[PDB]
């Protein structure tokens, strides 16, 4: 039943295929068994990705094939017909059910998100944030996805503003992942350099940056401390020996803070707020190394 | 008109949206009980558009006991905030469908736009989603619902009989 | 000499993993379909014997009923379970349909109470909160009309 | 104008041809091993 | 009808055109389907295309005569029978004399 | 205007469109007060900006 | 919107100045002719075609081939579709 | 330019998720309430 | 009887229950946790071959619980079982919830629910020792304050005291309890009226769960164990009572 | 003869078809690592990956794998039905089937052969279609569970009677049953065609060559 819908809603560019002069309907009836096979394949029941990769995979190399036909044998790069979007509809269609009917796979969904960057003389702006708004609100903890949609969104469109609301809304989800954290510090230099730089050729032609980077440190010190307490909240010696972990691995991270480094103002105020055994030692090497540098 | 839901579960909370309003006269009748209970309708009567899962053990302790005495935990606040579409607050405001009428007024108070109902039809839904578990989430939710019962069943009942060390 | 039969793959009509369902071929044919009119005959016959045999109008009644008689009802416009009733006893009724009980009962007036009807008051002075209450209107023969 | 190698490949791919099997079959020779 | 039914005054639909309120003499409130083949149930697809199709069929092949027989069948009371039958006449015996 | 529901071919029938009002989304904030003190914070110092 | 295949499809049968009349005659056309087109489009879906027996010659003729060639050069499924009992004795 | 260009940037396995594929290798092959029969 | 008898284990009718045949007879349960008796009651214990293990069997004594005075009197059905879900409204302690644990077996769970804390307290206590059951020491009017650590339960037992009983079955069996799902009230007739007789209570206790759509199946007084006392067994049906 | 022998020479005719969705679901179910449960729910695709692991680990301990990755190890041999192609295309596909398994022969202690002479078992059905080869070429391999498999697996033929009451046992076949097997008369012809074909391939191995001197000097005694 639905197989045979979907079925005849694909026959008529099929029939415009065979219409123009370069398809014929041996291949056009061979392309219908497989397209016959596929659909059957998705309709059952126990289909998984992998039977909607193939599909896909199919169906580019279809276009593909479609392509080279029509440049080989009447020379004309772009018809006038159905059947150009059709196909491009038929394999976004395919990505379109994948997502509905299989929402834990990852790899999925990212070949999704290729294809409609990939075509991105054509993608629509709202498509790709519709795509990525329902992949977030299906996987809320997971900061690879959070940093690729605020990275595509500052790194190709550049709009600073949506990529500092996507990272605040990420950061209320997962205030416990020290690589959003890091991150997140990471986007704030960048465009602290470029506006600067921006600043260098607009003075060519004619420390509230790294406070605000300096406050996000705070605040992540705050809240990965309270965290790697609360997980895993007991007696003195027990409490005691749990607080000098913390410290420990707070203090490790904000060492990888460094390595991620106005450098001696940035390095100086890290320092600042960790002073307000081994560890002291390595802070007053970061010290005489500081003034070295 | 009862456009989300939202069920509270030990591994986190979720949020579902409804793509048909059974209809509510003919609701004590033996045909719709039956479409409650098979799965074949309760598919079209509902459908999950989000599911955000607890952090720690410590933290779905905290936000179990904050569920049980009614109040608006911060990661409630966080799903609700990314989920519910920001309405006017005096015509057509979104309607969310709860299973405590105590739960309502706290989320009434923290976003204006949403009415929280808890009727025997939005029972009858959280009934429904209850009763057909894990099969609903199509596979997100990782972790077994029985031994996340059991080891917050143990803690929040030592919390509130205040057990000790000696 | 090119000798072709008619050869099936059983790959193609008899799927290989057990779980996957069997491909239905299709074939449009009016030869090949032959009693157009006559099947569809039968089936509009048995399509009308079942709704004779599915035929059950009557749902319930709501609550034990009125005490002298039902004579006036109105449905409320806005909402969908909610309907008031009222009697010639004088009492009169909200109704709740979804679980087909009272929310409340009134003695109205003394005679029959002739019309009743559903309404949003909008008093100039404030603005009742009509996600909380609904309002009835009953109006009677003692020459009176109570909100 | 003939078909080239690249989208004669396509050709065989999609429309799922199995003389070039069938050639190679035929063609295998045992006199090596 | 229903033998408990009495004099029926004051009838309305339902708000989502499925039920009818029914309230009469009797002192009673019922509510009955607006089409009586219909349950309240939600419907498979196939289920779903399965009713529609028997609706457009039927109603193709409303004229003929088995179909129109069995699809007019209904028992109605028996001062409802004889009222009517009596009705007839007199309406045929007007339409002589006119 | 009701000569045309009467010459239609299917009607669909809560027909009156609904008051469509704002979607939600991660993007944008939602209702542009911040609801968290970093968003506070990163508000207050770009106003200092 | 015209075939090959509406000869097959077509189904043979026997003005107004009413406009609710002309609406619905021209309404039950026009759905007419679309599921006849609908049905010739639909058979693109076929997933086999017949068989056949060309001489390829002049002095070659179909009436002399015979079953032991046919079973020669023919599929082994079907040259073991093709029986042969022999029971004598009833 | 040649600043912007050494500028630092963000990391993420999404991408890789998509073009990347598997390498790894293939393996090969009374109750509780019930007494016992004496 | 004594510290030495000899008893042959036999299956009842319902699963998970057995019988000890001696000169006289004793309900038993399959001890889960073996080797420590709960609330002090004697345990019978067999031995079984790998080497053999010592399996143990616990007494159940209807003196004390509610559930074997039933069991005892003779119920036709009763909707616990060796694989099932229990709903234990107003658990006290071991003394029973301990037994119906050891009925529904490892496979099933069962959720006990209490109010007052020191027997909170030997719930909790017993309850690590027994993995089929988790506790809750919270007002069990209230289902939703409790309603993130329940997920359909198949059977209701109640040992509720209160004289609400049939509104607070009614609620926790609309929120928890599965379709066509047994309930299992035991009914105190002093406890829900005081001045009108035990069998005016009685009739109008089985009124009400009528009313909340549980269709009794039957009723039992259980009347050489306690006085005045019964059980009713009803399934829950939500749809078309009659 | 009778209907029931003429029938039975037609259902062996029709041996291997899968003309309904039972017999599909037993003929797909027979397997040589998978159990029925497994085999029944897996395809060709699955099949085919590890196929094509399997060869490039075979290709590479041994090269010349190659040509068996060109052929029979191909997508268009994912989309081709045995039981359709005519006898001449059957001829070749024999042909280069028993060249595979002449050439992997020499390796049944591995996982690779198994699971690529798997893929064959179950596309090309060469154990009930040509079951001669699979037998002789792993017949040296007597006590193994490769063999224990094999056995299970195939409908035996003619000639290897007494594995026909050894078939779907637990203890594997004895040396005095294999000393029977060869003293038949028709098996050393067949048997010494098979080992003048190796001979001329060039690819024999101490093992076999020890297994076949000893049943020959038994077979003497």
Known sequence: SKTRYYLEQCIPEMDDLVEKGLFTKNEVSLIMKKRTDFEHRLNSRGSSINDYIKYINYESNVNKLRAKRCKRILQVKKTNSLSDWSIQQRIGFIYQRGTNKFPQDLKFWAMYLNYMKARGNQTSYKKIHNIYNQLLKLHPTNVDIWISCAKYEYEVHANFKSCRNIFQNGLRFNPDVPKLWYEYVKFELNFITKLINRRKVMGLINALRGDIALTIFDVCMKTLGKHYINKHKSDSKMNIELNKETLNYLFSESLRYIKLFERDYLINHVLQFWKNPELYLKTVMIDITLNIR | PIEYLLFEEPTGYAVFKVKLQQDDIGSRLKEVQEQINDFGAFTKLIELVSFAPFKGAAEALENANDISEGLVSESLKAILDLNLPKASSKKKNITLAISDKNLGPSIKEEFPYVDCISNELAQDLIRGVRLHGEKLFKGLQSGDLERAQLGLGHAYSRAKVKFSVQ | MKIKTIKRSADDYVPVKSTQESQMPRNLNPELHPFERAREYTKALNATKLERMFAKPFVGQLGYGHRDGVYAIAKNYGSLNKLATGSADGVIKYWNMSTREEFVSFKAHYGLVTGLCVTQPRFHDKKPDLKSQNFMLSCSDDKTVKL | PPPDEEEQLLAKFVFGDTTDLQENLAKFNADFI | ?????????????????????????????????????????????????????????????????????????????????????????????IKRRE | IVQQNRRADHLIFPLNKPTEHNHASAFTRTQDVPQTELQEKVDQVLQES | KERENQNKFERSTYQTKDKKLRAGLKKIDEQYKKAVSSAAATDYLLPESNGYLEPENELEKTFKVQQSEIKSSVDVSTANKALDLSLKEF | ETNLKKLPKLETGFDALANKKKKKNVLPSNDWFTLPKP | ARGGAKVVIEPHRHAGVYIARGKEDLLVTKNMAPGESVYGEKRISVEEPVPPTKVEYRVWNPFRSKLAAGIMGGLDELFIAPGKKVLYLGAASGTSVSHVSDVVGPEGVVYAVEFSHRPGRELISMAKKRPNIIPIIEDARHPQKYRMLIGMVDCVFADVAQPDQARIIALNSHMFLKDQGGVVISIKANCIDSTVDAETVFAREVQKLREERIKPLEQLTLEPYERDHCIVVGRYMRSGLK | SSLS?????????????????????????????????????????????????????????????????????????????????????????????????????????????????????????????????????????????????????????????????????????????????????????????????????????????????????????
């Open chain 5, 1 to 93: 009808h229903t033998k408990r039914m009495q004099h029926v005054f004051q009838v309305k639909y339902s708000m989502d055109s499925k039920y009818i309120i029914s309230g009469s003499d009797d002192g009673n409130v019922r509510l009955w389907r607006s089409k009586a083949w219909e349950r309240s149930n939600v419907k498979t697809t196939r289920e779903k295309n399965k009713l529609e199709y028997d609706e457009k069929l039927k109603e193709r092949f409303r004229h003929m005569p088995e179909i129109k027989r069995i699809s007019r069948h209904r028992h109605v009371p028996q001062v409802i029978k004889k009222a009517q039958e009596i009705k007839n006449i007199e309406l045929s015996s």
């Open chain 10, 5 to 221: 022998d003429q029938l039975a020479q037609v259902a062996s005719n029709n041996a291997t078809v899968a003309l309904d969705r039972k017999r599909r679901q037993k003929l797909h179910s027979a397997s040589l690592i998978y159990n029925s449960k497994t085999a029944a729910t897996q395809d060709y695709d699955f099949i085919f990956e590890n196929a094509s692991k399997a060869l490039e680990e075979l290709s590479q301990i041994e090269p010349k794998f190659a040509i068996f990755s060109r052929t029979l190890f191909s997508e268009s041999s994912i989309s081709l039905d045995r039981n359709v192609q005519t006898k001449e295309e059957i001829k070749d596909l024999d042909n280069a089937i028993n060249a595979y398994l002449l050439l992997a022969s020499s390796k049944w202690y591995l996982a690779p052969t198994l699971h690529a002479t798997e893929w064959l078992v179950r596309r090309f059905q060469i154990h009930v279609k040509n079951t001669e080869m699979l037998l002789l070429s792993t017949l040296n391999y007597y006590q193994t569970p490769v063999f224990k498999r094999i056995l299970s697996i195939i409908k035996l033929p003619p000639l290897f009677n007494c594995l026909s009451n050894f078939v779907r046992s637990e203890k594997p076949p004895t040396a005095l049953t294999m000393i029977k097997l060869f003293n038949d008369m028709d098996f050393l012809k067949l048997y010494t065609s098979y080992l003048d074909q190796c001979i001329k391939h060039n690819a024999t191995y101490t093992n076999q060559l020890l297994f076949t001197t000893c049943c020959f000097i038994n077979v003497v005694a």
